[PDB]
Amino acid sequence: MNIFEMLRIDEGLRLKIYKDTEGYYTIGIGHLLTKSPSLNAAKSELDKAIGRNTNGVITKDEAEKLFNQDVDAAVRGILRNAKMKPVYDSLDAVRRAALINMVFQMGETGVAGFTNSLRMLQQKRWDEAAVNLAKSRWYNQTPNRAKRVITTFRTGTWDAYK
Ligand SMILES: [Cl-]
Ligand SMILES: [Cl-]
Questions:
Q1: What is the distance in A from the centroid of ligand 2 to the CA of 148?
Q2: Of 63, 80, 142, 150, which has fewest CB within 10 angstroms of its CB?
């Protein structure tokens, strides 16, 4: 297991535009196109992301290509974030992937406000962090996925995904 398989499991793969759990237009492996309620807007952002007139449908290769860029982007966002980098650098490899998953889902922003959980993680106080992470909108809206990520931080293993 790795970050890619892990996220492909959390996000799924869809080749036509769809709405995510928050009602936003998305495509591929969790690639958010826009927060706008406009489908046209969405179709426009997609064609710009892909570089062709897609008509709201992409191929598998294209989806995987967006996915790689998004993963790369998430990592780099972490490395550039002063609040997050030190946490990330402090973690083992399995736990790093859990932090990337959260950023990929919620953005640097979103995560960068789990201040308290982040300190706990940096301290390697796993059970405590796991409890603090659950006190969130994130957990309450997507509990199953949140639990998988939270178990990963708690244990440092991939058991939740096997
Ligand atoms: Cl893009
Ligand atoms: Cl979920």
A1: 9
A2: 80
Beta bridge partners of 19: 25
CB neighbours (10 Å) of residue 92? 9
Q: How far is it, in rounded angstroms, from Cα 113 to Cα 93? A: 22
Buried b (16+ CB within 10 A) or exposed e, 101-111: bbbbbbebeeb
Cβ distance 91 to 55 under 8 Å? no
Residue 132 labeled ligand binder? yes
Is 104 annotated to bind ligand? yes
Please check if 114 is assigned to a binding site. Answer: no
Which contiguous run of DSSP H or E holds residue 28? Answer: strand 25-28
Q: How was this structure determined?
A: X-ray
Cα distances (angstroms) measured from residue 140 to each of 48, 104, 151: 34, 18, 16
Looking at the domain 1-162, which fold is it? Lysozyme (1.10.530)
Q: Are 46 and 58 spatial neighbours (Cβ–Cβ below 8 Å)?
A: yes
Show the tokens assigned to 19.
């709405």
Query: Who's near 55: CB < 8 A, 6+ residues apart?
Result: 43
Active-site residue, 61 included = no
